[PDB]
Design a protein around this ligand. Structure first.
Ligand SMILES: COc1nc(C(C)C)ccc1-c1cnc2sc(N3CCC(O)(CN)CC3)nn12
Ligand SMILES: COc1nc(C(C)C)ccc1-c1cnc2sc(N3CCC(O)(CN)CC3)nn12
Ligand SMILES: COc1nc(C(C)C)ccc1-c1cnc2sc(N3CCC(O)(CN)CC3)nn12
Ligand SMILES: [Cl-]
Ligand SMILES: [Cl-]
Ligand SMILES: [Cl-]
Ligand SMILES: [Cl-]
Ligand SMILES: [Cl-]
Ligand SMILES: [Cl-]
Ligand SMILES: [Cl-]
Ligand SMILES: [Cl-]
Ligand SMILES: [Cl-]
Ligand SMILES: [Cl-]
Ligand SMILES: [Cl-]
Ligand SMILES: [Cl-]
Ligand SMILES: [Cl-]
Ligand SMILES: [Cl-]
Ligand SMILES: [Cl-]
Lengths: 185, 185, 185
């Protein structure tokens, strides 16, 4: 029925810090091709608190494209957890947030329900791979990773996560999954 | 000149039983895209006799496609050997048959000349790979296998069989050979 | 700024002899698709002298294409070094030449500046890989090799040479780099 559910629960938001490189996106006009230019990169601030409200900043940037004439690009997002977070814990049962475009002290609400679908920790308890998506299989979906490239082994595991989460098999193939160019970055 | 000839002769029709998964087809409108949906599968009845007439039933099925809105699909074929078969042998010099669409006790002739071009046996004398085709290089052609996927090693061997059979090199590349989606089946 | 410069200097023109197979070209209408048909092949005469003028003949050929109806094709080029060459040396600091179409004792000037961008020698001091290109990143560019295919390892090294020479990253991906069909030749 296309309803996607979260796979990775009881996530530690303190670990939600550092740089992640976009590996692939789906073809939602909300994020594609705008957020899928070459060398696309996401820096996460890690948890900040505004009382019982938890949130995280994301700095997006990507490189120019000579053959397409596109200049380089950068913008900032804020992810606000929809459920209050206790001031005694940095762990949420599921990561469900609203997303804002931010500039200076201005913010504009983009979407009320962005989820961390899947999250994998390496052997040092740092995030290796993150998948972000909506509540339906045709809403924006992004695969990002700690390194610019992943082995084929790894990529097929990440695609299998989307299947287990409820994405239909015919959506898990091009032109509905598109890989981001990370060469020469 | 595009005339294709059979490579694999003296075939045992008793071994023509079990399930085979479609790996690739050519682009003949007779079979593509109708018989090339995801998870396409062929069950062979193995030899049946109607006097000196030999034949085999094939149950086709494939899975639905959400993004294309296609429902799942299934139909039945009958392959009738064109040459009489002696009641004392299950082996033909070449497998040359007419193909019918079948439903209940009704049948409709589709094509008078379908051949087994290539057939490979594993070390237990079971069929591992089958290629079915016509008498010309632009007539329907199907590659099927005992498993859902084959190694690259193996796939290049099967493509080389089509070259040895008379298929022109420029037909052995996309968009003239198309691979079937066998993931998540 | 798209200006490409030569990487490989102090090249020995005596070694510029033998057969090379085209691996990929860019999409310049000057050479694509004309010089990129299947089984495309280049025979180099090795250095000839006309006084202090050095030059080399190149015989191009490629195979027919049944599905496209194209007949086989062959033609001859002459590469004339633009700088005089001393009669005591077979080595140039850079290989910069004009290119002519040749037939019988007739010649027609095609382009005044064709360069050897990159050249790699194997362990026997023979050319293994050659990249030929212009003075801008959107002028014709051809990758050729001593064998019909190269390992992925090797191909990524050759693409990295074009980046170091000044080709923009967004030009080093399809549809701006196109691979030549070398199967069944
Ligand atoms: C999973 O989803 C998202 N993930 C991210 C990162 C955390 C990886 C950012 C954004 C979305 C998103 C979801 N729904 C919408 S609308 C929108 N805007 C794009 C920026 C714009 O200025 C140009 N098109 C205006 C529209 N972004 N998103
Ligand atoms: C090698 O060839 C074939 N192999 C097979 C299997 C044994 C793998 C089946 C069928 C052909 C075939 C050859 N010539 C035609 S016409 C046709 N029909 C498709 C079913 C239809 O109901 C929808 N298009 C009506 C038309 N099938 N074939
Ligand atoms: C690197 O560049 C080239 N390398 C080669 C080989 C040494 C690999 C040959 C040619 C060029 C080239 C450069 N600028 C032009 S124009 C042209 N002609 C193609 C033949 C034609 O008869 C049909 N289109 C008339 C036009 N070839 N070239
Ligand atoms: Cl940039
Ligand atoms: Cl670029
Ligand atoms: Cl949105
Ligand atoms: Cl990996
Ligand atoms: Cl892609
Ligand atoms: Cl189904
Ligand atoms: Cl599906
Ligand atoms: Cl038919
Ligand atoms: Cl295999
Ligand atoms: Cl394909
Ligand atoms: Cl030929
Ligand atoms: Cl051909
Ligand atoms: Cl030119
Ligand atoms: Cl190699
Ligand atoms: Cl290509």
């Amino acid at each position: 029925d296309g309803v996607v559910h979260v796979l990775s629960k009881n996530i530690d938001v303190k670990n939600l810090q550092g740089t992640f490189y976009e590996i692939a996106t789906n073809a939602s006009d909300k994020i594609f091709p705008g957020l899928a230019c070459r060398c696309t990169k996401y820096e996460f601030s890690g948890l900040k608190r505004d009382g019982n409200l938890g949130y995280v900043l994301i700095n997006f940037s990507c490189a120019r494209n000579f053959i397409f004439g596109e200049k380089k690009s950068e913008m900032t997002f804020k992810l606000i957890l929809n459920k209050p977070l206790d001031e005694n814990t940095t762990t949420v049962e599921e990561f469900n947030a609203s997303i804002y475009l931010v500039q200076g002290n201005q913010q504009i609400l983009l979407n009320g329900n962005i989820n961390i679908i899947y999250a994998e920790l390496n052997e040092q308890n740092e995030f290796e791979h993150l998948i972000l998506g909506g509540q339906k299989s045709i809403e924006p979906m992004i695969i990002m990773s700690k390194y610019r490239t992943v082995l084929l082994d790894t990529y097929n595991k990440l695609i299998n996560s989307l299947y287990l989460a409820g994405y239909e098999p015919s959506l898990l193939t091009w032109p509905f999954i598109i890989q981001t160019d990370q060469t020469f970055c």
